[PDB]
Design an enzyme around this catalytic site. Sequence first.
Site, short mmCIF file in Angstrom:
data_model
loop_
_atom_site.label_atom_id
_atom_site.label_comp_id
_atom_site.label_asym_id
_atom_site.label_seq_id
_atom_site.Cartn_x
_atom_site.Cartn_y
_atom_site.Cartn_z
N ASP A 35 0.93 -1.10 -0.10
CA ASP A 35 0.32 -0.33 0.10
C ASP A 35 0.55 1.25 0.31
OD1 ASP A 35 -1.82 2.06 0.22
OD2 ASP A 35 -2.69 1.41 2.20
N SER A 199 -0.79 15.35 -11.89
CA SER A 199 -0.98 15.62 -13.40
C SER A 199 -1.78 16.79 -13.38
CB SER A 199 -2.41 14.73 -12.94
OG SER A 199 -2.59 14.29 -14.22
#
Length: 330
Positions: A35, A199
């Site tokens: 994770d 992004s």
Amino acid sequence: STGSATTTPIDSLDDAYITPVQIGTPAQTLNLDFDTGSSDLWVFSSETTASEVDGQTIYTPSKSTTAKLLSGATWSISYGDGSSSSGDVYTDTVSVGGLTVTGQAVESAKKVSSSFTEDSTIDGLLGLAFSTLNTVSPTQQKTFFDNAKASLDSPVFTADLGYHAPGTYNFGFIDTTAYTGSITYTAVSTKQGFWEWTSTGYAVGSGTFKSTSIDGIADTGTTLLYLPATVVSAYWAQVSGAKSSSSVGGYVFPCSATLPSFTFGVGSARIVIPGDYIDFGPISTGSSSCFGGIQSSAGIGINIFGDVALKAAFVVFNGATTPTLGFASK
Ligand code: NA
């Protein structure tokens, strides 16, 4: 040193991926969920409340000649999905894919929430976010990566998740055979303890690319792609009959649909998520309503590039002094 381990989807939907991890001496092999959105290595154990264990493999520290109680240390964690676990701590030898760390904190669960008990395939979690999120008190502990780092050939790990197929986690090296083209690196903020990056925008299907900054985290422990409601609405507006269902808890679409791809930007590069990756199948067995793999982040307080996005790429988690993320097509 390096390590290389195969990671395998737990079910036909790629809900999560499990990676075998050797703990203790002699080795006890548990299948952990790696994770990158958390920082605790915790396991089902001989200490876990018996009614909360249903099929998981447990770690038994009393059977490990290298286990030692980390006296006084406790831990307790809550995840973004509402799940939780807590317990005490041992140090032991932990190996992943041939890479060994001695003295790793292994957080032994005394209690786990229902979602963990109900998932017999996941024996615990191995956190790969920054050690500033580790929940051990009163002495915070390091992740397996942070403990391994100084021994590694290069201070990196890579995630290469499969679509309905196994993939790989590598530590300490880039496998130049595992991706196509070049790797585009992007800046990371560690301010919230995550692999947080920005992004450069998105496109829906064959549509034009929208240049827009989307801050989010690279989180292998999250199944879906969680993005701002504007972006998500623009995606699902291209699917006839898709809608947001308050009763189901997100966007659903007719199982008869063909889904468009979704592209996200990494600097000037583009990662394309095929439409198929966004189908999470019937909402209940036999339903003709299917659950979407792109969902709104509104109310979660962060955008999450979970497995839906990451498995479209070869992802480099560069833990050098200035951390960075790298993405390549594959
Ligand atoms: Na679900």
